[PDB]
Amino acid sequence: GLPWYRVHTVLINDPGRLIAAHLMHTALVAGWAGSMALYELATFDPSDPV
Amino acid sequence: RGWFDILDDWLKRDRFVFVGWSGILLFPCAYLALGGWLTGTTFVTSWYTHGLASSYLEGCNFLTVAVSTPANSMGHSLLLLWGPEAQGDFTRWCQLGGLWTFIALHGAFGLIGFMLRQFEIARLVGVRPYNAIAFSAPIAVFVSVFLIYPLGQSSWFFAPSFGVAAIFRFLLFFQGFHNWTLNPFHMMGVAGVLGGALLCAIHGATVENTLFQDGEGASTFRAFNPTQAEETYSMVTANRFWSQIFGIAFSNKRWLHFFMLFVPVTGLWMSAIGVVGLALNLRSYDFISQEIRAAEDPEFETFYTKNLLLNEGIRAWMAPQDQPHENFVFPEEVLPRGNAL
Amino acid sequence: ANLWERFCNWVTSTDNRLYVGWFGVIMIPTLLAATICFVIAFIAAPPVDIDGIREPVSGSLLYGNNIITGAVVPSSNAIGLHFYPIWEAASLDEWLYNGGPYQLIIFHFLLGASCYMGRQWELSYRLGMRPWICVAYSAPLASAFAVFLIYPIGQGSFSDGMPLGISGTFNFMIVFQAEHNILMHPFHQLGVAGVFGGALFCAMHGSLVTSSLIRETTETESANYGYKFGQEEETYNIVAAHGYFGRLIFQYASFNNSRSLHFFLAAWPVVGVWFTALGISTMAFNLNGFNFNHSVIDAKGNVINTWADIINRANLGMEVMHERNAHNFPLDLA
Amino acid sequence: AELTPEVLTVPLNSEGKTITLTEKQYLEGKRLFQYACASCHVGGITKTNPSLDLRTETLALATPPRDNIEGLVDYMKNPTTYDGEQEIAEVHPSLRSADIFPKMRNLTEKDLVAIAGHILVEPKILGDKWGGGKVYY
Amino acid sequence: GTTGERPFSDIITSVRYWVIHSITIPALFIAGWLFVSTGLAYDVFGTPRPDSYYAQEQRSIPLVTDRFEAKQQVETFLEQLK
Amino acid sequence: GFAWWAGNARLINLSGKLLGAHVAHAGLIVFWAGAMTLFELAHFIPEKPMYEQGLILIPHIATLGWGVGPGGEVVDTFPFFVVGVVHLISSAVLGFGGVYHAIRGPETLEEYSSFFGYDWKDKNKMTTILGFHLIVLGIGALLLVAKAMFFGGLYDTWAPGGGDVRVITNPTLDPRVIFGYLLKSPFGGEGWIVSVNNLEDVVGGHIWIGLICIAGGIWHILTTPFGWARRAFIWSGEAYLSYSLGALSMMGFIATCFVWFNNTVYPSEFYGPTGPEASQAQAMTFLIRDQKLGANVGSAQGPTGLGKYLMRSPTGEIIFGGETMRFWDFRGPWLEPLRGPNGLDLNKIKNDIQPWQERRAAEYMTHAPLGSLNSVGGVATEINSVNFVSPRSWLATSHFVLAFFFLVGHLWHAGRARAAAAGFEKGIDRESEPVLSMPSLD
Ligand code: CLA
Ligand code: CLA
Ligand code: CLA
Ligand code: CLA
Ligand SMILES: CC1=C(/C=C/C(C)=C/C=C/C(C)=C/C=C/C=C(C)/C=C/C=C(C)/C=C/C2=C(C)CCCC2(C)C)C(C)(C)CCC1
Ligand SMILES: CC1=C(/C=C/C(C)=C/C=C/C(C)=C/C=C/C=C(C)/C=C/C=C(C)/C=C/C2=C(C)CCCC2(C)C)C(C)(C)CCC1
Ligand SMILES: CC1=C(/C=C/C(C)=C/C=C/C(C)=C/C=C/C=C(C)/C=C/C=C(C)/C=C/C2=C(C)CCCC2(C)C)C(C)(C)CCC1
Ligand SMILES: CC1=C(/C=C/C(C)=C/C=C/C(C)=C/C=C/C=C(C)/C=C/C=C(C)/C=C/C2=C(C)CCCC2(C)C)C(C)(C)CCC1
Ligand SMILES: CCCCCCCCCCCCCCCCCC(=O)O
Ligand SMILES: [Cl-]
Ligand SMILES: [Cl-]
Ligand SMILES: [Fe+2]
Numbered sequence A: 001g002l003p004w005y006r007v008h009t010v011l012i013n014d015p016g017r018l019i020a021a022h023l024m025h026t027a028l029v030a031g032w033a034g035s036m037a038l039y040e041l042a043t044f045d046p047s048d049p050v
Numbered sequence B: 001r002g003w004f005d006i007l008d009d010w011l012k013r014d015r016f017v018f019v020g021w022s023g024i025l026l027f028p029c030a031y032l033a034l035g036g037w038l039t040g041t042t043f044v045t046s047w048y049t050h051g052l053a054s055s056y057l058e059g060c061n062f063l064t065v066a067v068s069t070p071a072n073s074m075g076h077s078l079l080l081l082w083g084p085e086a087q088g089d090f091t092r093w094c095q096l097g098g099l100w101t102f103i104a105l106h107g108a109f110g111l112i113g114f115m116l117r118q119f120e121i122a123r124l125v126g127v128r129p130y131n132a133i134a135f136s137a138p139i140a141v142f143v144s145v146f147l148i149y150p151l152g153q154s155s156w157f158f159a160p161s162f163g164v165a166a167i168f169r170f171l172l173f174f175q176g177f178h179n180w181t182l183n184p185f186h187m188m189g190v191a192g193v194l195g196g197a198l199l200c201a202i203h204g205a206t207v208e209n210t211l212f213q214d215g216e217g218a219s220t221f222r223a224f225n226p227t228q229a230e231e232t233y234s235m236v237t238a239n240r241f242w243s244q245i246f247g248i249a250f251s252n253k254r255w256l257h258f259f260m261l262f263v264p265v266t267g268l269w270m271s272a273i274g275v276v277g278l279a280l281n282l283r284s285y286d287f288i289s290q291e292i293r294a295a296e297d298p299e300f301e302t303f304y305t306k307n308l309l310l311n312e313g314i315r316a317w318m319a320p321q322d323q324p325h326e327n328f329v330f331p332e333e334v335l336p337r338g339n340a341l
Numbered sequence C: 001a002n003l004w005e006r007f008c009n010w011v012t013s014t015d016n017r018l019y020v021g022w023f024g025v026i027m028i029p030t031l032l033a034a035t036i037c038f039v040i041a042f043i044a045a046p047p048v049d050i051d052g053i054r055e056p057v058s059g060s061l062l063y064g065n066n067i068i069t070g071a072v073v074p075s076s077n078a079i080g081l082h083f084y085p086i087w088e089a090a091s092l093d094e095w096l097y098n099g100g101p102y103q104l105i106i107f108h109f110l111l112g113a114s115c116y117m118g119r120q121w122e123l124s125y126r127l128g129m130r131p132w133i134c135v136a137y138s139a140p141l142a143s144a145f146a147v148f149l150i151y152p153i154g155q156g157s158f159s160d161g162m163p164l165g166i167s168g169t170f171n172f173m174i175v176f177q178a179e180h181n182i183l184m185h186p187f188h189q190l191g192v193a194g195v196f197g198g199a200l201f202c203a204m205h206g207s208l209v210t211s212s213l214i215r216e217t218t219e220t221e222s223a224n225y226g227y228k229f230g231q232e233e234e235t236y237n238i239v240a241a242h243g244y245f246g247r248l249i250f251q252y253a254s255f256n257n258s259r260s261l262h263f264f265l266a267a268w269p270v271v272g273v274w275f276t277a278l279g280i281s282t283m284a285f286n287l288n289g290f291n292f293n294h295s296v297i298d299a300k301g302n303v304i305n306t307w308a309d310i311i312n313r314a315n316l317g318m319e320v321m322h323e324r325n326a327h328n329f330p331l332d333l334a
Numbered sequence D: 001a002e003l004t005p006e007v008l009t010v011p012l013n014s015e016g017k018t019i020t021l022t023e024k025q026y027l028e029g030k031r032l033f034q035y036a037c038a039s040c041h042v043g044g045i046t047k048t049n050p051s052l053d054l055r056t057e058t059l060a061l062a063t064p065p066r067d068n069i070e071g072l073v074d075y076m077k078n079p080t081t082y083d084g085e086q087e088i089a090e091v092h093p094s095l096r097s098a099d100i101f102p103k104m105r106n107l108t109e110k111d112l113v114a115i116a117g118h119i120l121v122e123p124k125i126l127g128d129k130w131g132g133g134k135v136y137y
Numbered sequence E: 001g002t003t004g005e006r007p008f009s010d011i012i013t014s015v016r017y018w019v020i021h022s023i024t025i026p027a028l029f030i031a032g033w034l035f036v037s038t039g040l041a042y043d044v045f046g047t048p049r050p051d052s053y054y055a056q057e058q059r060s061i062p063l064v065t066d067r068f069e070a071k072q073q074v075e076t077f078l079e080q081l082k
Numbered sequence F: 001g002f003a004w005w006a007g008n009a010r011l012i013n014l015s016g017k018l019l020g021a022h023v024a025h026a027g028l029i030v031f032w033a034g035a036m037t038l039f040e041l042a043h044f045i046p047e048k049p050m051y052e053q054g055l056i057l058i059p060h061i062a063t064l065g066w067g068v069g070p071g072g073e074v075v076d077t078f079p080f081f082v083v084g085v086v087h088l089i090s091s092a093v094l095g096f097g098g099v100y101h102a103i104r105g106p107e108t109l110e111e112y113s114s115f116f117g118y119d120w121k122d123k124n125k126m127t128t129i130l131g132f133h134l135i136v137l138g139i140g141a142l143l144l145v146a147k148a149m150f151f152g153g154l155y156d157t158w159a160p161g162g163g164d165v166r167v168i169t170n171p172t173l174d175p176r177v178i179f180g181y182l183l184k185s186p187f188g189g190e191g192w193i194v195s196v197n198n199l200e201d202v203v204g205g206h207i208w209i210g211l212i213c214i215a216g217g218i219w220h221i222l223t224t225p226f227g228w229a230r231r232a233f234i235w236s237g238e239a240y241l242s243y244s245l246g247a248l249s250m251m252g253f254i255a256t257c258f259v260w261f262n263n264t265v266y267p268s269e270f271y272g273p274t275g276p277e278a279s280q281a282q283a284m285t286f287l288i289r290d291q292k293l294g295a296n297v298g299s300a301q302g303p304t305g306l307g308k309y310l311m312r313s314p315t316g317e318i319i320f321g322g323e324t325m326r327f328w329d330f331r332g333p334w335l336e337p338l339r340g341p342n343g344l345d346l347n348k349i350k351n352d353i354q355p356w357q358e359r360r361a362a363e364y365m366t367h368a369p370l371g372s373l374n375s376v377g378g379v380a381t382e383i384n385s386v387n388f389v390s391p392r393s394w395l396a397t398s399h400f401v402l403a404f405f406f407l408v409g410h411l412w413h414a415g416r417a418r419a420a421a422a423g424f425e426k427g428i429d430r431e432s433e434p435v436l437s438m439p440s441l442d
Helices: A004-011 A015-043 B003-011 B019-042 B092-096 B098-125 B131-133 B138-151 B162-179 B184-208 B233-247 B253-279 B288-296 B303-322 C003-011 C021-044 C090-096 C102-126 C133-155 C166-180 C188-212 C238-248 C258-281 C307-321 D023-036 D038-044 D056-059 D069-077 D109-129 E017-039 E042-047 E070-079 F003-011 F016-043 F058-063 F079-105 F122-148 F175-181 F198-220 F227-232 F237-261 F275-292 F322-327 F347-349 F355-365 F391-420
Strands: D010-011 D018-020 F154-156 F164-166 F311-313 F317-320
Touching: A004 A015, B003 B019, B003 C102, B019 B098, B019 B184, B019 E042, B092 B098, B092 E042, B092 E070, B098 B131, B098 B138, B098 C238, B131 B138, B131 B253, B131 C188, B131 C238, B138 B253, B138 F079, B162 C307, B162 D056, B184 B233, B184 B253, B184 C188, B184 C258, B233 C102, B253 C133, B253 C188, B253 D023, B288 B303, B303 C166, B303 C307, C003 C021, C021 C102, C090 C102, C102 F391, C133 E017, C133 F237, C133 F391, C166 C307, C166 D038, C188 C238, C258 F391, C307 D109, D010 D109, D010 F003, D023 D109, D038 D109, D056 F391, D069 D109, E017 E042, E042 F355, F003 F016, F016 F058, F016 F079, F058 F079, F058 F154, F175 F198, F275 F322, F275 F355, F317 F322
Parallel strands: none
Antiparallel strands: D010 D018, F154 F164, F311 F317
8 A cells, every 4th residue: 555654645636635634734733823822821921021 | 949959958968077957057166166175275374264374385284274264253244255345355355264155155056056967867867866865965964064053153153164174173162062962963863874884884795795606707796797687696695694693684675775875864864953953052962950960969970970071171271262253361270170180 | 313413403503583603602691691781780780980089970870860871881990901700899889889890791792792793704604605794794893892992901991991871982082082182093084984985875875776766666655565575687777877877977987887886885884994993993002193283383483273273272171171080190191 | 473583582691691592593402402301391391390390480580590591501411409409410311410311412512502592482482382381282 | 888088098098198298287287386486376365474474572363353344454464564 | 717906816726826925925024124124223323212213123123132231221233233134135035036936936836846836625735834834933932042041141121220131041941830821811910921021931931832833843744634623624725824814813912912011021111111101100200209399198198088199909009099090010120129018118119219210200201102193292182392102002003903904804714715615605506595495484
């Protein structure tokens, strides 16, 4: 079968599932940003900007 | 069949030294980088940037000549000949360090040209482009060490100077200041370089000692024809041998040769990453747990603490001369020193 | 059917999963002894007074070391080159304090590695091979002899042999540079050329062969499956490889004889490493690297520094700091 | 910079009289210093007794003052301790002891002046380096 | 195994080759020689002669300390010798 | 069937041309001995110690009694000139015979004479040539004895009064002494045969080896190899070469250590101080200097709690302190007058150090065998000034390199001899590949 390092080539000729993989990546990144913002809000001390 | 295709024809003719479109970039820049280095190491000083002699003309030999970096006060100036520092004065250009940027930048563009040449010839001859791919490791090392590294620091001054002993000095700087030997990215590079040298010696030796007898002479070299279809050595006997000496052995010539590409190329890419970190002084300098214990416990000693004392010797003893622009004056009483020495 | 002849037949049997052989009769025990003592010492040995000044150095994981900083510490300067087996100590406690395990390990390991090289000859003979793989391995082995035995012989003490540790290796390198200016020694320079070039030629050969694999597989499968173990046909096209590389440089700079090429692959790193091992082995007798300190002066007699003088400054800072409590007199003569 | 007569001009005696060395003299004294003295006195220190160097300031405080051609010439003939209280020909090369220090056998009176001259000139050129030790290398 | 150029071992065993290069090779060697022997190389490249690293009573390095006046700094250093 | 770069291997079965090669090559060895000595003599200056002057042949001659007097002072250089001249002349005689046999003489000897002709596989003839050469060598070793005992003696660094030439009238014959050296451990404070420290043992050992070499030469002319020996070895010219490469390698390594540690048959007066010697001498120098100033050197505690000047060795012996604690096994004529039964005697140290011992310690300290490859003397951070590299560093490093490569040559030719003897030095027979007939490992 495919070597492990080629598993994502099954999408080269499959625009719909390429679009689906691109959406999932966009979802992961935006979700990262939401989570990182929240972690920072929970740990940020705003009482002295100096 | 207009002029572009006529020129293409000519660039790509099969001559003693193939030219190609990539030759237009490669040959001037390679020649100039080389030319600049030989010119500077023969005739040009480092008196005004470093306070150093650095050419044959001044008394230096092959080990101590160098095209030294520009002065820290140049910042990251491109130091163009026609630029505002030298103002077209070739002599001043030389004395200010202009040849260092000249060599570094033409060298960079030569390496691009060389790698393009590996792409161009490979396309014309019908091979796959893995040699070009393998050359990315040399490029990553050059760019990370000669360009990225000083760009994170204050100036080109702290780049390596092009010379045998000057590079030796670079190695020693990175120990005293960056503790580079403690860096896991350097360690992976070391494993890749040594791993590759080992692969090289062990694969050549194996092939030469599992040769088929294909001729009658004691010189086994003659008994090879470049066009023969048969393997010239026994992969089966080689595999038995190593399986029984070492436990495991290669069985696939294709994996074997791909592994030989992979190991030194990966090793060099890894070290390049570490040097990027060192551009920022993002060092693997210390182990925090060790320093906490050592500070609290004066009988705790490791090879780790011992090397940092060495590093501290290097810094205090080399910095005044190696960083003259800083006007460091360390009186005798401040130099760290063991007993007697 | 004679009892000794059966044993002899099992020792040299080509049918054992790992070959034993006569060299292996010595190699198996001595490597096991070295390995077992090393594993136990790296984990649990107490601090060792490496420089004989009652300043014990902690090397093991249990006494506050990690993987990078741990070491089996060289035996005490007070012992010098004296033989210090277990049975020469009043107690194991004493043997541990003075660095006994280091001696046990390095002597068993050097023996077993020497028998490793012989075992390579030996199995080559039983399989009908040519003999010289062991000659390639003599380059690494000579290098281990240099830092574990020869350099300690010339300086007078196993306390200056290379520690069996990662940071200890680095300590050894730094102090070697201050005491011998090894960077300026041409045999170390040749070793760098053997090791850089060997890596270079490793990459070159691996990429040139890989560049010229004959199409045997589809895009959806590893090209490795295009080679089958023990096939008689070569799996790549060396004439295509020669045609590429010869055009990349020029024709006569490329090998078209596989036997010469692989011999070159073998020769270059082996010989560079011989020299670098010889470099360590001759600096053991203090024939040090080139000294250009104050070699350039001006018409008045001012010193004009060169990069060699800058190196010297670094070297001085390693010299004055190393073993900072161990010198009472002004010259570090060994 | 260059090796001008001013740098080559050194005190002849403690009275204040001076003498100007030729460059030939200086170079010959440097060679003779390397041949007979540098094995202990490289760079103006003293390997076997670092507490005493060949800096002009130290020689000026020696008894017999040795910061001059005559003082130095005499020292090479009949060396004393720093306070002048005891003669040390038996452990220090000198003409008085050329039997046990055979490199001194072939040294003429003009060689000694050249050696003496070199010692006095060199701190004028190298400054702190001369007699300063590894700190100034 | 050839692309049409004259073989090297043909060229340098030929009499015409050596007739030309017994002149061109020494002449270049001599030119390079004279480039140094006349002291031109020092002036072209700005390299200090052995007598012009320092002023007489000077042991400071004439170190460039400014980016845009660097050219004037060096010239100021060179005058401090003449 | 050899290439030009393996061209001498074409001489294996050409006994007459092979003789020319060996004899011409012996001439090169004699030439260099001759020429190097004349060069050393033309450059020699007697006011300077030999070891300040790059000499390695003249010190070997001096050690045999010629040309020196009390303390190693060179008295007469004519013996030096003679040794070089005679060697030099003798090399033309060897050159002549050498090129004659290699170019003009009979290509092979076995037709011309059954005596000088040989086949490598003739185990009887090979042992007869061995036995002849053993006898020569036994004679060689006796010539040293004869010099020591009947023709002037040898230089004795240990002779009372600074060293001197001394005839040896009671060579050690006791096999427990002679062979006891062969059984000491090579480790510290023992040093195997390198620890030999008096000329009586040196001369007696050569009596023994001389006789043993003659006995064995005679033995091997009269016998043939027994059957176990027949079955243990390869019988071919390249195998015999490989055996000798092994032995020369071992011998080179021994010589390296000899010149590095031994100051008896490598007198330090001539070769410079050993590494241990020089290190000990520095501790002596500063002990002397400091005690002259009033330091009580026995009670001075150093920074580590160990004595600054004097401490104990692991078996109790009073020894020099500082890093030279590693070097306490050193023995030398300038130091032994201070040794009592417990090691360095503190009362002798306070009362009996002599000016000549102070001189000698300063001299050896400042001539330690440390130096750069371009011959800058001293530690690697030293400035230029002193042009010096000890003969012992030159002689140790050079012979470690030759020993090393001769071990590699032993492996090369031993492995190849084995493979050629069995018929696969040229590669694997495609039609009869051994592995293809073995069962698979798994
Ligand atoms: C936009 C960027 C991008 C995209 C879309 C691709 C896409 C592709 N690459 Mg390329 N590649 C990229 C960047 C990119 N690459 C970079 C930067 C490099 C250099 C490192 C490479 C080097 C490279 C090689 C060497 C190869 C490919 C191959 C492929 C194909 C198959 C990959 C696969 O199945 O992986 C499968 C991978 C895994 C199952 C696990 C890998 C896990 C990695 C090592 C670590 C985890 C990272 C982490 C999860 C998230 C990323 C963090 C950060 C990047 C944001 C696919 C078309 C393959 C190919 O050509 O096939 C024909 C192939 O051999 N790529
Ligand atoms: C000590 C070094 C040494 C010695 C003694 C020999 C000796 C020999 N070689 Mg080997 N060889 C050597 C090094 C040496 N070689 C090296 C380094 C190489 C590699 C470059 C070779 C490569 C080589 C090959 C390829 C072959 C030999 C062959 C031979 C033999 C025949 C030579 C012949 O016919 O040439 C004839 C040469 C000449 C007529 C030219 C003149 C030679 C003379 C002797 C010059 C000497 C001048 C000298 C100053 C004389 C002084 C005169 C007076 C004192 C009497 C001969 C016994 C040949 C052989 O084995 O035959 C089967 C052969 O095929 N050799
Ligand atoms: C070990 C070296 C060696 C060996 C084995 C041989 C062997 C041989 N030679 Mg060669 N030869 C040698 C060295 C050697 N030679 C040298 C050095 C020279 C130059 C002087 C010659 C010149 C030479 C010529 C010109 C001829 C031979 C011939 C012969 C053959 C017959 C010899 C004979 O009948 O003499 C029997 C014995 C004698 C005649 C008496 C010799 C006794 C000697 C002189 C005394 C012993 C010397 C001593 C052991 C060491 C020297 C002293 C030194 C330490 C100062 C024989 C194959 C002949 C040949 O090939 O036939 C065509 C021939 O014509 N040889
Ligand atoms: C260059 C010198 C030399 C050489 C090459 C030979 C070669 C040979 N001898 Mg001769 N031999 C010599 C000198 C030499 N001999 C001398 C001088 C004598 C007189 C004592 C003898 C006495 C002699 C006898 C009595 C016999 C031989 C035999 C043989 C053959 C077998 C050798 C063998 O098996 O060794 C291999 C050695 C062994 C298997 C055991 C050696 C054990 C040693 C002592 C232990 C060494 C350990 C250690 C690694 C080394 C350190 C030194 C140690 C002593 C501390 C072989 C042809 C045999 C033969 O066939 O004769 C017809 C035989 O029986 N030889
Ligand atoms: C469905 C839905 C929803 C929900 C959603 C969610 C809940 C989301 C989440 C998401 C998320 C929450 C995500 C996140 C993500 C994350 C990630 C993706 C991460 C990343 C990672 C990585 C990549 C890393 C890496 C690394 C490491 C680990 C180390 C260091 C280095 C690095 C950085 C490389 C809602 C309601 C809205 C709407 C409706 C629908
Ligand atoms: C920079 C510049 C430029 C350019 C320049 C150039 C282009 C140059 C070139 C130059 C050159 C192009 C040079 C060359 C030189 C060379 C040489 C200098 C060589 C040498 C060599 C040798 C020395 C060798 C020898 C040897 C040895 C020693 C050992 C071994 C063997 C052999 C043979 C290798 C221009 C104009 C644009 C302008 C701007 C600036
Ligand atoms: C075979 C052969 C070979 C080799 C050869 C040989 C090795 C030879 C040898 C030879 C020889 C080895 C020679 C010798 C010679 C010598 C001589 C000829 C000598 C003479 C002497 C003289 C004349 C002296 C004089 C003098 C005197 C008496 C005194 C002092 C001074 C003088 C020094 C002047 C070859 C490889 C090439 C080639 C092939 C073949
Ligand atoms: C002179 C002298 C001396 C003496 C010496 C001597 C007495 C000697 C001895 C020596 C000897 C007496 C030696 C011996 C040796 C031996 C050997 C070296 C062996 C060898 C062996 C081997 C090699 C074997 C092998 C084998 C095996 C094991 C198995 C089977 C097979 C074969 C055969 C391979 C002395 C020190 C007192 C002092 C100084 C001088
Ligand atoms: C892509 C190709 C770029 C190559 C550029 C070639 C550079 C041309 C070199 C000539 C530079 C001469 C400038 C010196 C005089 C300028 C005077 C001034 O500063 O105004
Ligand atoms: Cl340290
Ligand atoms: Cl000390
Ligand atoms: Fe290959």
